[PDB]
Design a protein around this ligand. Structure first.
Ligand SMILES: Nc1ccn([C@H]2C[C@H](O)[C@@H](COP(=O)(O)OP(=O)(O)OP(=O)(O)O)O2)c(=O)n1
Ligand SMILES: [Mg+2]
Length: 215
């Protein structure tokens, strides 16, 4: 067992309304959990609890080891595209190239004369939203970790590109890794080992895509 929430309730403000209410799930090592729900349902807050930024008022949580987190808000720091993806982690060509490919960034990088040394975040190149999202995803996926928290990482991508990168990066490249992906898309829920749909803090549904189809 890699991540567990048991009867978890939590509050961002003392005596407010709970941001998560009696949440339950388990992820085995190497599995994919899809977390879905409308805006404000508590999805990012659930990731924050796993990262220790939010403590439960009721219930138990299990998770061990290092986390790589991909924010739903993409970001770039001043430096090359290679520096932004590596982001202080030791460099390996094969690992770097495999992440770039899985995130469809090889196409973008090949078009620049400076290739992977193109400078970002310093007033020169202004990236598209989708480029910034794929760079942010690549940064999180390059980091070696026991648990990957990917919070709606496909911002600004058209539905086919999102599908292709979900398959190449989240399903294939990351096949052996424990993953929590905040996402609403049907194919992602169908491919996940477990799905958790949140609504206003509560568990709207928890189970498999097949179980939901059975209903
Ligand atoms: N430091 C914080 C963070 C969030 N909230 C509130 C805001 C929401 O009403 C509720 C859930 O916030 P989330 O960020 O967890 O919501 P989602 O991630 O599910 O929404 P979205 O899809 O818009 O990202 O908690 C708060 O009071 N204090
Ligand atoms: Mg969020």
């Amino acid at each position: 067992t890699e991540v567990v929430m048991e009867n978890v309730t939590a509050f961002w403000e003392e005596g407010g309304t709970p941001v998560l209410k009696d949440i339950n799930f388990k992820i085995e090592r190497g599995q994919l959990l899809a977390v879905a729900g409308s805006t404000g349902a508590g999805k990012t807050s659930l990731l924050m609890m796993i990262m220790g930024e939010l403590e439960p008022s009721e219930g138990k949580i299990k998770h061990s080891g290092r986390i790589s987190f991909c924010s739903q808000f993409s970001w770039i720091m001043p430096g090359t595209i290679k520096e932004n993806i590596i982001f202080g982690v030791s460099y390996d060509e094969y690992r770097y190239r495999s992440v770039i490919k899985a995130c469809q960034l090889e196409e973008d990088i090949s078009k620049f004369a400076e290739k992977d040394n193109i400078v970002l975040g310093e007033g020169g190149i202004t990236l598209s939203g989708g480029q910034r999202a794929r760079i942010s995803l690549a940064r999180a996926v390059y980091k070696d970790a026991d648990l990957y928290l990917l919070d709606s990482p496909f911002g600004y991508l058209d539905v086919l590109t999102e599908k292709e990168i979900f398959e190449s990066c989240v399903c294939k490249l990351m096949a052996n890794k424990t993953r929590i992906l905040v996402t609403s898309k049907m194919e992602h829920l169908k491919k996940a080992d477990k799905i958790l749909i949140l609504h206003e803090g509560s568990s709207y549904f928890y189970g498999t895509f097949s179980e939901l189809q059975n209903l």
